[PDB]
Ligand binder design. Structure first.
Ligand SMILES: Nc1ncnc2c1ncn2[C@@H]1O[C@H](COP(=O)(O)OP(=O)(O)OP(=O)(O)O)[C@@H](O)[C@H]1O
Ligand SMILES: [Cl-]
Ligand SMILES: [Mg+2]
Length: 263
């Protein structure tokens, strides 16, 4: 059902190719008189593993069409690329590095992210994102969230930070919803601090092992402008990164809590 509504694009349809990635381009679609985004494959050869995986990525984005999930329009062949809605503000990662953000916006970003993740986990069967980090949380012109980057999702280096400890303890464990919950904990931490996690520490491997034994990013202090809400968010964050997956809350329980923070 997913591959049906998608379109094949041709590069002549696009103009004004302008790098936004980190490769991703903002392109004008001339006939539609609107801008779109296209994520082009890095590889030198137009490989058949990729062309099917980019389709998978697109197909999974269409299955989770929702307010807080990036819309997807289809595929380009001429350059192999995934075609999708353009988000004017860009990534959360970029926003956290740009300037201090008002607290009420921080709580809204967190909530909206939680709402979208809840939507994925409520599908039948659940859809695990497995790559939730600020670089894949996109923000529209009005700073509303749309989750993106479904390359690793399953219907069954920055990344070590977002990796759950059970994924380091066990070779080849079954992916579950509790993976996404841990990663979300590390997303909250970044929103609280506006820092990248472990950006100080040099021995990546040493930190890995410490994490297996319950070590996490340093807790931020309670902020002056919204100390009640901030304390509540820090507390939620901590339950979300618990070492035991089964103790971590569900996104159903999380969204209930983050909604109260937005008042
Ligand atoms: N729709 C979009 N609108 C605007 N900027 C985008 C969009 N999609 C991605 N970007 C930007 O480009 C970056 C590329 O991220 P994206 O996850 O899409 O590609 P990727 O990480 O290379 O993918 P993959 O994991 O499949 O190799 C984002 O972090 C963001 O800064
Ligand atoms: Cl408060
Ligand atoms: Mg990405």
């Amino acid at each position: 059902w997913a591959l049906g509504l998608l379109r094949t694009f041709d590069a002549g349809e696009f103009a004004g190719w302008e790098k936004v990635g980190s490769q991703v381009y903002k392109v004008r679609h001339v006939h539609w008189k609107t801008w779109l985004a296209i994520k082009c494959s890095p590889s030198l050869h137009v490989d058949d593993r990729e062309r099917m995986e980019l389709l998978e990525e697109a197909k999974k984005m269409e299955m989770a069409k929702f307010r807080y999930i990036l819309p997807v329009y289809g595929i380009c062949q001429e350059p192999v690329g995934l075609v999708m809605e353009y988000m004017e503000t860009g990534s959360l990662e970029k926003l956290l590095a740009s300037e201090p953000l008002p607290w009420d916006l921080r709580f809204r970003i967190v909530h909206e992210t939680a709402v979208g993740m809840n939507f994925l986990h409520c599908m039948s069967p659940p859809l695990l994102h497995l790559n939730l980090k600020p670089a894949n949380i996109l923000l529209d012109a009005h700073y509303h969230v749309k989750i993106s980057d479904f390359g690793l999702a399953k219907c069954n280096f920055g990344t070590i930070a977002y990796l759950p400890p059970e994924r380091i303890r066990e070779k080849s464990r079954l992916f579950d919803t509790k993976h996404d919950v841990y990663s979300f904990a590390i997303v909250i931490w970044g929103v609280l601090t506006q820092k990248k996690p472990f950006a100080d520490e040099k021995n990546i491997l040493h930190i890995m092992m410490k994490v297996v034994k319950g070590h996490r990013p340093e807790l931020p202090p309670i902020c002056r402008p919204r100390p009640r809400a901030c304390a509540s968010l820090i507390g939620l964050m901590q339950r979300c990164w618990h070492a035991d997956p089964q103790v971590r809350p569900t996104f159903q329980e999380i969204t209930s809590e983050t909604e109260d923070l937005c008042e």
